[PDB]
Amino acid sequence: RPDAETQKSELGPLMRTTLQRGAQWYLIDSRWFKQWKKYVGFDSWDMYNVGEHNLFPGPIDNSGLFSDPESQTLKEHLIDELDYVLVPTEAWNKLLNWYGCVEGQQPIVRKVVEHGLFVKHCKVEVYLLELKLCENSDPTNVLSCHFSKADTIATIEKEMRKLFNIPAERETRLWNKYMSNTYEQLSKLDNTVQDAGLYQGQVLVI
Template sequence: MAEDGAVDQETQREEIATLLKTPLCRGETWYLVSSDWFRQWKKYVGFDSWGRCQTGDRNIYPGPVDNFSLLKVGDKLDIKEHLIDELDYIMVPTEGWNKLVRWYGLTDGQEPIARKVVLGGMFVKHHKVEVYLTKLNLCENSNMDSTVTRRFSKADTIGMIRLFFSIAVGY
C-alpha cells in the first residue's frame, strides 16, 4: 500500500482539484473512482473548506483506492448497470488517477476502471467519458458454438477488435 506521507494533504488537494478541471479531449483515458472512497479522501485532505479541521487525521485515512461498490458481484472487471456520475462515481484524468494510486495504492484484486473520451450527442456533438462499453460476441466464421464475449469502447478500431480476437482464440 502506498503511503501519502511523501506528499502533504494540501499539495494533494491542490493537484487533484486542478486536474479535475481538465477539459475532456477525444481519445484520452479517464478513470472511474468510487464516490464513497473519494468523499473519504476529500475529508482526509480537507478538500472542502468546511472540512479542513480534520485534515490529516489518521482516523479518516481513506486507505487504498477501493472501487468495489462500482463492480458487479463476483466480477472484478465489469461495472454495475445504472451508475450515476457524482453520486456513485467521479471521473479523474489519467494523471490524477496515477497520483491517487501512487499516494494510496489500489485495493488488492481490483483493476483500474479506465474509460475513453468519445464524441457523443446526436445533434450537438460534445466530448464525454464512455462509462458503459459496447458488448460484442465474437466468433470465427459464424461458429456460434465458440464465442468470445468482450466489451469494447466506441473509440476502439476494427483492427483492435481483430487483434483481441486473434489473441483470444489463439491464432
C-alpha cells in the same frame, strides 16, 4: 505519503482538465473519494477534520462497483456524480502512489469519445451496450457485441463479417429497424455509430 496540503494542492488543477478525445480516464468509488476529499479538505467549505487519522481513506477500494468480484466486470446503472467520480491519468498515478489499492484489483480505465445526436459533446464512454447482431438466414440467433461510439460502421461491418464465416469477396448490405416499423438501410461505411445514431442493445443484422 506527503502532507495533506501537498496532496490537495496537487490535485487542485485536475478540474481544468477538459474531457478530450482519445483521452484516458478512470473510475473511483465516490464513497472513497468523498472521504479523501474530507481528508485533505479539498473542498474549502469542508476542512474541519483536516488530516486527522480517523478520516483516513486508506488503500483505494472500488470493490462495491464491480458486479462479479472475480471477473472485475462493473455494475450497471452507475451514475457519474453519485456512485463514482471520474479522474484524469496523472491524478491516478499520484493517488495510486500515495494510497495504493486493494489487492486483486486493476485500474478501471475508459476514454472519452465524441457523442450527441444534434449538439456534439465530450463525455467519458461507458456502459456501451452490447449491440444485438444477427444474420439474414437465422432470425432466432442473436449475438451481443460491444461497440465503442468512436467505432465506425466499417469496423462494425468487419466484426460482423468475422463471426458469420463470411470472407471479403462477396458484397454486403446493412440495415437498421429502430423505432420506425419500416426497415431502413445503412448507406455510409465511413461515419461513426453516433452520427448514425444507433440505439443500444438492438439487432443490427447482416
